Amino acid sequence: KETAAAKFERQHMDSSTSAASSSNYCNQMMKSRNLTKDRCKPVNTFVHESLADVQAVCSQKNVACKNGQTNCYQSYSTMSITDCRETGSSKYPNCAYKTTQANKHIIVACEGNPYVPVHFDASV
Numbered sequence: 001k002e003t004a005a006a007k008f009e010r011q012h013m014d015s016s017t018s019a020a021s022s023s024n025y026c027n028q029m030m031k032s033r034n035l036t037k038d039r040c041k042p043v044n045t046f047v048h049e050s051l052a053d054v055q056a057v058c059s060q061k062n063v064a065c066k067n068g069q070t071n072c073y074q075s076y077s078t079m080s081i082t083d084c085r086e087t088g089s090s091k092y093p094n095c096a097y098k099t100t101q102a103n104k105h106i107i108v109a110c111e112g113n114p115y116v117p118v119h120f121d122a123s124v
Helices: 004-012 025-032 051-059
Strands: 043-047 061-063 072-074 079-086 097-104 106-111 116-123
Touching: 004 043, 004 116, 025 079, 025 097, 043 116, 051 072, 051 106, 051 116
Parallel strands: none
Antiparallel strands: 043 079, 061 072, 072 106, 079 097, 106 116
């Protein structure tokens, strides 16, 4: 099994780097995190912050999730994020990604006891 909360960290957390290191970053991380095992996950975002920092977002600004549910929260501060979007030459099993670093507010769905992030919703 893999808890909702550990799957979030596996898919979205990357505190070991402060930014998108190189153009190689996405191809490497997407595969590394097993995001390219059943298909090429089209898009994925990695947050370069500490796990305490991202968890604290569950107590920040409450906003509507893209799905209409209401358990989403927006971060008061912008965080360092790396955006990975699948290219055109990307053909499974050879998935390809364009790495894109930025600093934006993250929106995450939170749930549970403790109330921890379980889904990345967006960034603005």
